[PDB]
Every structure is written in structure tokens, then in C-alpha cells.
Design an enzyme around this catalytic site. Structure first.
Site, short mmCIF file in Angstrom:
data_model
loop_
_atom_site.label_atom_id
_atom_site.label_comp_id
_atom_site.label_asym_id
_atom_site.label_seq_id
_atom_site.Cartn_x
_atom_site.Cartn_y
_atom_site.Cartn_z
N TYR A 43 0.85 -1.25 0.00
CA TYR A 43 0.00 0.00 0.00
C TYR A 43 0.85 1.24 0.00
O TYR A 43 0.28 2.33 -0.22
CB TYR A 43 -0.97 0.03 1.18
CG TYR A 43 -2.19 -0.83 0.96
CD1 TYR A 43 -2.07 -2.24 0.89
CD2 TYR A 43 -3.48 -0.27 0.83
CE1 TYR A 43 -3.20 -3.04 0.71
CE2 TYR A 43 -4.62 -1.07 0.65
CZ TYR A 43 -4.47 -2.45 0.62
OH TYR A 43 -5.59 -3.22 0.41
N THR A 79 -23.85 -4.55 8.95
CA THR A 79 -22.94 -5.66 9.30
C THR A 79 -22.23 -5.33 10.61
O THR A 79 -21.02 -5.53 10.73
CB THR A 79 -21.91 -5.90 8.20
OG1 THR A 79 -21.18 -4.67 7.94
CG2 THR A 79 -22.67 -6.26 6.91
N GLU A 132 -13.46 -1.76 12.37
CA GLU A 132 -14.72 -1.05 12.04
C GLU A 132 -15.85 -1.50 12.93
O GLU A 132 -16.74 -0.70 13.24
CB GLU A 132 -15.09 -1.29 10.58
CG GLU A 132 -16.37 -0.70 10.10
CD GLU A 132 -16.39 -0.85 8.56
OE1 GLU A 132 -15.73 -0.03 7.87
OE2 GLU A 132 -17.06 -1.80 8.02
N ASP A 161 -17.00 5.18 -3.54
CA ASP A 161 -16.32 4.29 -4.47
C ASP A 161 -17.15 4.42 -5.74
O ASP A 161 -18.32 3.89 -5.74
CB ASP A 161 -16.38 2.84 -4.00
CG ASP A 161 -15.61 1.88 -4.92
OD1 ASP A 161 -15.51 2.19 -6.14
OD2 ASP A 161 -15.13 0.83 -4.43
#
Ligand code: UDP
Ligand code: UDP
Lengths: 272, 272
Positions: free
Chosen positions: B58, B171, B229, B252
């Protein structure tokens, strides 16, 4: 502690502005869930001080003001009323709910009295326990909920005669010789002097600045057009509030009725 | 400093929620006037620290991330980038505007690294000058303004896959044995781990709480469904943020296009 999920793709209101351009909430019905706010504020054991002046004949308004405040103002939270009066013995003994106390403070141009008195009082050490101060007119009655949704570092209240007005119609002080002066091309809202407040520190700062501005104008032989409201408006122009209360919180039904954008009339003028 | 007067009887938006039920602004285009906010924040000489992780492959995303941050992130304000990397020598030397600095911090399950590292770093005395910390993913590019409108004591960002979802579709971690557990009938929003921040003190508190929760789950042999998260979402459920960023701030476009409620795409995922 379950409550409806917020709906990201549904506006709270389609008929009014609910956030200012500097991201302060404008507090209308349908923009808050009081059960969430009550929890946040009770976790901090929030204590709200409420100042009110009842000088000369205005001591007659205290009975209804305090009876209706007990039904609608900050119920469930710690409240201390501070009644500033030239007639302490005329203050009605109204029965208060648990967690709520009342003190009488005797008061001795007089246009400066409210900002002078709140400034001196707001600096006293016996306020160490009070978290927020709220300052309101006495010739008013509560008719519906006024609660912790209003609390924030600094708030003012939209004047009910001017919320729909353009800024050039606002009755700001327009003479450059006054400390309250605001140019014709400046101004976000016209706030009413009859309901403002914030944390103790922000109320110390606002009332000091306003009292000091008023003393400068007096030294110079000028009285702002609407007295301490003119200086309130110059203050909140330069130090923008972190919440703005809609006119639900300061209304005159005899003058202005019950227009469509008001879903609740929470604190209203008493006639004549 | 003249700007349009706010319009009390005109909603900022008719298609989205712009304030949460606990009176936190949800930041969309058309809800702020950046000239007013820039002034407020420059009067305090606001310094924003931006943390970003670029570990293993990354590090390839840093060049575009920093080039576009220089065009769009907090321009005019003091900014310090903190790049956490296992390859300090691979960090690209990108030219920075005045008032902006970059530091490289070398990093040594790894699911805990981001909250652990930001927690340790956020407590260091060399942050004495930084007012707010913002933590973002690196595999992203800025395409439009991201500025002081986001700053506040504590903020999270609506996940772009879930802003239109009901809470039972979120989620969240649903196992009671995890410290991240949220019941099916609870939850305001689903926040993404890829953009959160606040004052240094609020970021110290959030990253500590999340790291400590993750260590408890590890001791118990459980890994939350979406790792840090999941713990971010339990934290912001219990400590509600004072601003919420709309998905303009974390988008996105390859996955989700440019839907009608997005007026600007400000910080978007880089593909593959
Ligand atoms: O945009 C909104 C919509 C609703 N609410 C508040 O959240 C609670 C529940 O809202 P809902 O519209 O779901 O009312 P219900 O139909 O359940 O009585 C009430 O206090 C509403 O005023 C809010 O703060 N923001
Ligand atoms: O409800 C609103 C409407 C506008 N604005 C902002 O205030 C500035 C001027 O708004 P206006 O709609 O008057 O735009 P103009 O037509 O003058 O370009 C812009 O930054 C808007 O995004 C805002 O913060 N809240």
C-alpha cells in the site's frame, strides 16, 4: 436504549432551514429525539440555571411563568431559578418538583441592568455547580416542552417578527457611532433579547461584552435602537451561536397566530 | 465579511437528512458556507493532523493520496501528515504548500495495529500543537474540497454501501461474546473505518477504547466480523459523534456510480 433509526434519505423538515451555514443546528420540532438527548445530558448530571427579571409591575407575571416552567422546562433535569426583583417579598411561593430550587436576588441606564446583572451574577463562585445559564423574559408562559435540546455552548433565538425577513429589514443598530452597529449588507438572523443562553463561561462572555459595549455607547451619548437586543445581535454576529432556537421557543400567538411552519408553540407571550 | 444571508424558510436539502436526532450536523454539500467556517477556524490557527497507514504494497498509493490531499484537503490551514509505514524509504517526496509538513513513523493481531498505533501516537507530547486528528485510508484520492466543515470534537463517516440500509442489514458484530456486539434493534448509522477523527482528546479516547475492546476480544478467542470497524461502530453508538460526514467524503465511484443525492464526490476509492 431503543428508538427509531434515523432515515438518511428523508429530510427532517421540508419547509424550514434546520442547520445554519456554519453548521449550528436550528432547533425545530422533528429535528431531535429527546430521549437520546435526555440520556446524554442526565449522564453528565446537567444543571441548568434560569434567570428571569421581575421588576416593578412585572412581578405579577411570576406565578404563571414559574407554574408553567415546572410543567415544561427541563423536567427531569436539575434546575435552579434565579429571580432578580426589586420586590423579593412579592415572589410567589410556587411548589417545585424534585431537583429544582429557586433563589431570589434583590436588584437596586436601567437599559443596562439585565446585561450588567447577569454578567456580575454569572461570575459568582456559588454557580460552580451550574452547567448552563438561560436568560428569558418573565411576561411569558410555557405551553409545551422546552428541554435539553436547546443546550449548547452559546445559543440565541430567532425573533418571531423577523424570521421571514431579509437582513435589510432587520432592526439592527445602523449608526456607525454605536458599538452595536451592523452594516446593511451583514447579518445572519435577527435574535430576540428575550431568550438566549449557553454554558456559564459563554454567558459570562456574552453579557460582559454586551454590558461593556453599552457602557461605551453611554459614555458617547448614544443609546442603541433596541437597547441590549441591539448589542446581543452584534455579539452573535461576531461570535456565532452553536445552536439557534426557532421561533417555537419565543412566540406571540395574539400577534402572529399559529402559522404552518410552527408545529409546537413552546414559550409564548402573555398579553397586555 | 459579506456572504449570502441564510434563508430560514428554505431547506438546505430536500432529499437527505442534514442533522441527526441528537442534533449533530450531517455534512453534505449545500449545508455549509466554507467562507464562514474558514474564518472561524483560521482565527484559532487550527492545526489538523492527518494519519495514514501505508504498509506493504500500500506504499504505492501514497503518491496520488498526497498529491491530491495537497490540492483539496484543508488548503489554507495548518496540516501535518503522519505516514505510518514499514518502508520509510519508499515514501514519495511530494511537494507541499506553505504551512504543511509531513513526518514518517516507522511501524513494526495486525487487525489491531491501526487503533493501537493511533492510540500510542495520539498521546505523544509532540502533538501539543495539533488541534484535530483525522484518520483515513491510503488507497483513496481526493477529487474535491475536504475542509474544516468536518472538524468537531468527534466525527464518523457514513459507509457508502449502507447509508440507505435499515439497521438490521448493517454488518455490525452480532455475537454477544464480542465487545463490539450491537443488538439487532439498536444502531443509528453504519460508519466506515476509513475516515474518522475529532479533537486530539476525542481521538485518544476512541482509539484507546477500540484497542482495549479488541484486546479483550483477542483474550477471549473472538475476532469481530469487520475488525476495527466493528469496534468503531460500537464506540460511536455509545459516544455519539458531534458531526457525521455524508458519503461525499468516502465514496467508491467504480462500485456505486454518482447517484443523485451526491452533489460532490470528495474522497474516493482507488481501484483494484
Ligand atoms: O429527521 C428526524 C425525524 C424524526 N426525529 C425524532 O425522532 C423521534 C421518532 O421519529 P419518528 O418520525 O420515527 O416518529 P414515530 O412515527 O415513531 O412516532 C421523534 O422524537 C422525532 O421528532 C428526528 O429527530 N429527526
Ligand atoms: O441552506 C443553505 C444554503 C446555502 N448554503 C451555502 O451558502 C453559500 C451561498 O449559498 P447560495 O445558495 O446563496 O449560493 P449562491 O446562489 O449565492 O452561489 C454556499 O456556500 C452554499 O452552499 C448553506 O450553507 N446552507
Amino acid at each position: 436504549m431503543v428508538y427509531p433509526q434515523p432515515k438518511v434519505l428523508t429530510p427532517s423538515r421540508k419547509d424550514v432551514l434546520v442547520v445554519t451555514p456554519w453548521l449550528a443546528p436550528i432547533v425545530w420540532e422533528g429535528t431531535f429525539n429527546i430521549d437520546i438527548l435526555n440520556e446524554q445530558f442526565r449522564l453528565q448530571n446537567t444543571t441548568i440555571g434560569l434567570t428571569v427579571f421581575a421588576i416593578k409591575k412585572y412581578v405579577a407575571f411570576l406565578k404563571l411563568f414559574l407554574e408553567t416552567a415546572e410543567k415544561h422546562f427541563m423536567v427531569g433535569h436539575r434546575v435552579h431559578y434565579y429571580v432578580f426583583t426589586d420586590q423579593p417579598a412579592a415572589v410567589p411561593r410556587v411548589t417545585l418538583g424534585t431537583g429544582r430550587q429557586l433563589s431570589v436576588l434583590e436588584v437596586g441606564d436601567v437599559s443596562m441592568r439585565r446585561m450588567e446583572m447577569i454578567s456580575d451574577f454569572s461570575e459568582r463562585r456559588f454557580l460552580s455547580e451550574v452547567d448552563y445559564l438561560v436568560s428569558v423574559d418573565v411576561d411569558m408562559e410555557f405551553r409545551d416542552h422546552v428541554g435539553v435540546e436547546i443546550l449548547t455552548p452559546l445559543f440565541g433565538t430567532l425573533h418571531p417578527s423577523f424570521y421571514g425577513s431579509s437582513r435589510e429589514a432587520f432592526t439592527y443598530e445602523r449608526r456607525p457611532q454605536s458599538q452595536a452597529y451592523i452594516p446593511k449588507d451583514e447579518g445572519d438572523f435577527y435574535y430576540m433579547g428575550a431568550f438566549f443562553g449557553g454554558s456559564v463561561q459563554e454567558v459570562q462572555r456574552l453579557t460582559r461584552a454586551c454590558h461593556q459595549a453599552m457602557m461605551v455607547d453611554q459614555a458617547n451619548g448614544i443609546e442603541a435602537v433596541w437597547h441590549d437586543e441591539s448589542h446581543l445581535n452584534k455579539y452573535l454576529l461576531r461570535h456565532k451561536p452553536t445552536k439557534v432556537l426557532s421561533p417555537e421557543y419565543l412566540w406571540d400567538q395574539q400577534l402572529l397566530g399559529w402559522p404552518a411552519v410552527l408545529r409546537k408553540l413552546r414559550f409564548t407571550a402573555v398579553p397586555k
